Amino acid sequence: GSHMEAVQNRIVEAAERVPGVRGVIHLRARYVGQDIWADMIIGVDPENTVEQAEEICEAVQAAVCGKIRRIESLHVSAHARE
Amino acid sequence: SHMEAVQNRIVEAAERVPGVRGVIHLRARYVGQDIWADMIIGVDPENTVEQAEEICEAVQAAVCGKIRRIESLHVSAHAREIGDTTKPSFSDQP
Ligand SMILES: [Cl-]
Numbered sequence: 141g142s143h144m145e146a147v148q149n150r151i152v153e154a155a156e157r158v159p160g161v162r163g164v165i166h167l168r169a170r171y172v173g174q175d176i177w178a179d180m181i182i183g184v185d186p187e188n189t190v191e192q193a194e195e196i197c198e199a200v201q202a203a204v205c206g207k208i209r210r211i212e213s214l215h216v217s218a219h220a221r222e
Numbered sequence: 223s224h225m226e227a228v229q230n231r232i233v234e235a236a237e238r239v240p241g242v243r244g245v246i247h248l249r250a251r252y253v254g255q256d257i258w259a260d261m262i263i264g265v266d267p268e269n270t271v272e273q274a275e276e277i278c279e280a281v282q283a284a285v286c287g288k289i290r291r292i293e294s295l296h297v298s299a300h301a302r303e304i305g306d307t308t309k310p311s312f313s314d315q316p
Contacts, residue, residue, distance in 0.1 A: 190274050190301045191267040217298060220271045 144169070147208065151178065154204045155216075160184060160196035162221045175212035180204075183221025193218040225250075228257065228289065233310055235288045241265060241277040243302040245310040256293035261285070264302025274299040 162183035169178040197216040233245045243264035250259040278297040
């Protein structure tokens with residue numbers, strides 16, 4: 141509901157502030173008990189290395205998980221984007 | 223389960239594709255007679271993202287080409303060091 145959109149907006153806002161992120165392409169978030177499990181795809185520079193893209197991915201994980209307490213599990217991956 | 227033969231075929235297939243440093247993970251199930259799968263490959267860290275997506279597509283074509291009962295296969299890549307010998311996982315979500 142309205143409840144869930146608010147958290148999604150929090151997650152996007154958080155992820156999008158992280159340097160190297162070219163928008164959030166996709167976000168699946170779901171309640172499992174009281175906790176949230178999420179899967180996210182970010183856009184990144186096509187010319188990034190895989191190592192570099194994974195660094196950005198981890199940074200997003202820390203930023204999002206840091207600001208939204210109720211997230212128990214967050215997978216982040218990157219697609220090339222312009 | 224009973225279906226180790228197909229898993230081994232899938233891994234062997236994927237691992238022959240150039241740019242693949244082993245299969246990190248594979249979730250496969252039968253739906254009727256068809257197989258639906260999700261797979262994670264290891265790749266050169268120094269590959270570009272563009273290039274890793276290219277490898278991913280190559281694996282999709284190679285695996286789906288050699289194991290014809292696969293109706294749907296998603297492939298994604300993580301960086302993997304060359305000294306890594308970690309056996310492929312077949313669980314349901316790391
Ligand atoms: Cl061949």
